[PDB]
Amino acid sequence: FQGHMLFISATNTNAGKTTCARLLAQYCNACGVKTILLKPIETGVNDAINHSSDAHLFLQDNRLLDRSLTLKDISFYRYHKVSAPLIAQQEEDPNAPIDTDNLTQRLHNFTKTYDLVIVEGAGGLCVPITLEENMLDFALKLKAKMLLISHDNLGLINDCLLNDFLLKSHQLDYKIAINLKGNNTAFHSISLPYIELFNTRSNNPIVIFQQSLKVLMSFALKGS
Amino acid sequence: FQGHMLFISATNTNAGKTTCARLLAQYCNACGVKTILLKPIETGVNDAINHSSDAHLFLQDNRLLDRSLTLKDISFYRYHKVSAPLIAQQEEDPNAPIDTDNLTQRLHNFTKTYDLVIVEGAGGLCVPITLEENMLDFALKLKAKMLLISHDNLGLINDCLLNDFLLKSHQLDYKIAINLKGNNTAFHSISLPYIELFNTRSNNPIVIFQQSLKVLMSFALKGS
Ligand SMILES: Nc1ncnc2c1ncn2[C@@H]1O[C@H](COP(=O)(O)OP(=O)(O)O)[C@@H](O)[C@H]1O
Numbered sequence: 001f002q003g004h005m006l007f008i009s010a011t012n013t014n015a016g017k018t019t020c021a022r023l024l025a026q027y028c029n030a031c032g033v034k035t036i037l038l039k040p041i042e043t044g045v046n047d048a049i050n051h052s053s054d055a056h057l058f059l060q061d062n063r064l065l066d067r068s069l070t071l072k073d074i075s076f077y078r079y080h081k082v083s084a085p086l087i088a089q090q091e092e093d094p095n096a097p098i099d100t101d102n103l104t105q106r107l108h109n110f111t112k113t114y115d116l117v118i119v120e121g122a123g124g125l126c127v128p129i130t131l132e133e134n135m136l137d138f139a140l141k142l143k144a145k146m147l148l149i150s151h152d153n154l155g156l157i158n159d160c161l162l163n164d165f166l167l168k169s170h171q172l173d174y175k176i177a178i179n180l181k182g183n184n185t186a187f188h189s190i191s192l193p194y195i196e197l198f199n200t201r202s203n204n205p206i207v208i209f210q211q212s213l214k215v216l217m218s219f220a221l222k223g224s
Numbered sequence: 225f226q227g228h229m230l231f232i233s234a235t236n237t238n239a240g241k242t243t244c245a246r247l248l249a250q251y252c253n254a255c256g257v258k259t260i261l262l263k264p265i266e267t268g269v270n271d272a273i274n275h276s277s278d279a280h281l282f283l284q285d286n287r288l289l290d291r292s293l294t295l296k297d298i299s300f301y302r303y304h305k306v307s308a309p310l311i312a313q314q315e316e317d318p319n320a321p322i323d324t325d326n327l328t329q330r331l332h333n334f335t336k337t338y339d340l341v342i343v344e345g346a347g348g349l350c351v352p353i354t355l356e357e358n359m360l361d362f363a364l365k366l367k368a369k370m371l372l373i374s375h376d377n378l379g380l381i382n383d384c385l386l387n388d389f390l391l392k393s394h395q396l397d398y399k400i401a402i403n404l405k406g407n408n409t410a411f412h413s414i415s416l417p418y419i420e421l422f423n424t425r426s427n428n429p430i431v432i433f434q435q436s437l438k439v440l441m442s443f444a445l446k447g448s
């Protein structure tokens with residue numbers, strides 16, 4: 001096949017998509033699985049004055065494989081407003097709705113030259129891109145596998161299960177992974193006992209990202 | 225009919241269930257709609273040393289209608305662990321799984337003596353109560369209407385829409401209401417523009433709690 005494609009979404013913004021995407025791509029590249037990081041849509045950015053956006057971090061890592069990459073090669077719709085993409089676009093660029101057909105072509109083109117194309121979304125699954133399409137719809141159009149990153153705090157059970165319900169209702173292969181931060185041992189006492197019960201009762205278990213680099217690489221590469 | 229029953233859930237813990245439940249019950253009582261506040265299951269409490277739990281706040285308000293009420297009349301399963309009810313029960317009371325049939329009877333009994341019975345859940349919809357039942361399942365068994373309180377911060381769009389998807393997939397009447405806090409005007413710039421678009425495109429609109437006391441009272445009392 002051409003390169004595999006893995007979409008990274010989350011329970012919400014700030015859950016750890018960027019952090020976990022970078023860790024996974026680093027691991028894959030270290031294993032000889034040539035992997036690129038893409039951030040097709042990004043809000044809340046000012047590129048004239050700040051070089052620490054998700055796309056900038058991705059670019060730093062990606063340039064270890066291709067010096068010629070620039071920001072515009074890996075991020076295509078970028079807005080100042082710290083909001084959902086649809087709202088940012090309507091306010092800042094009302095004459096250019098986000099074109100997911102175009103994005104699909106650009107993203108799939110990278111499957112020629114990489115073993116794995118990692119595509120970070122923005123916010124969570126239901127975040128609107130166009131009037132018709134949210135982030136999940138975009139992932140579906142891409143025919144990507146899904147990695148959904150959860151936060152590690154009280155409330156993650158609800159947030160994971162809401163996403164599980166939405167994901168299992170659609171036709172895609174997915175995995176939910178908890179981004180367990182350094183210094184959090186409340187997790188193991190408070191939330192983990194339910195994750196373990198859930199996993200004994202589910203065909204698709206919720207995993208801990210930091211325990212799962214090998215498993216998630218395998219997931220990302222399996223099948224067609 | 226006997227009194228109506230309204231379940232109050234949320235996007236997650238700390239979104240405003242208790243605060244909004246109290247405001248709604250106060251409004252209803254002021255309008256002559258005799259309303260009780262119940263917190264059947266509560267975690268994270270130590271009643272020997274703290275009298276500020278949701279059930280204690282409810283009790284204060286409820287005693288304006290019935291001096292004889294005590295905590296045990298309005299809250300039935302109470303645990304120290306700051307966790308989902310299922311985990312707290314398994315750790316603190318392994319021989320007494322939460323009995324939702326019993327809770328249903330106790331809650332419905334209040335429909336004899338009140339025009340409206342408001343039942344606050346714990347956390348969000350997918351929070352586990354027993355191995356088989358979550359908070360939504362409990363609300364379904366109760367045959368209550370649902371009021372789902374959302375937080376007012378960046379990310380509410382995703383959280384509201386995840387809940388909308390779950391709720392619309394089940395057989396219950398529901399309303400999602402945003403708990404818009406004092407001093408937040410970012411909401412109106414960041415999130416509200418999408419809520420307005422969504423509402424023009426949806427048969428069941430997302431409302432702002434603080435704008436909606438009359439509407440939510442009407443909702444709670446309508447029909448059988
Ligand atoms: N495992 C982690 N350990 C420490 N800090 C983390 C971890 N995961 C995320 N962070 C921090 O949390 C913030 C949000 O993470 P980020 O990966 O950007 O999330 P998202 O892409 O979902 O918005 C960042 O400041 C990031 O450095």
Ligand SMILES: Nc1ncnc2c1ncn2[C@@H]1O[C@H](COP(=O)(O)OP(=O)(O)O)[C@@H](O)[C@H]1O
Binds near residue numbers: 240241406
């Ligand atoms: N509209 C509001 N204005 C100010 N403070 C609020 C508001 N809503 C909630 N709070 C505060 O936020 C915290 C969580 O609210 P609470 O109603 O207890 O939520 P939940 O019942 O969902 O856990 C409390 O400290 C509460 O006083």
Ligand SMILES: NCCCCCCCC(=O)O
Binds near residue numbers: 157191308347
């Ligand atoms: N204030 C105590 C609330 C307990 C919240 C439980 C949340 C479980 C979850 O969804 O992870």
Ligand SMILES: NCCCCCCCC(=O)O
Binds near residue numbers: 044379380383
């Ligand atoms: N860091 C900028 C992220 C933008 C997050 C948009 C979240 C929309 C929502 O679900 O309410």
Ligand SMILES: [Mg+2]
Binds near residue numbers: 013014018
């Ligand atoms: Mg972010």
Ligand SMILES: [Mg+2]
Binds near residue numbers: 018019120
């Ligand atoms: Mg990110």
Ligand SMILES: [Mg+2]
Binds near residue numbers: 242
């Ligand atoms: Mg609370």
Ligand SMILES: [Mg+2]
Binds near residue numbers: 241242243278344
């Ligand atoms: Mg509460």
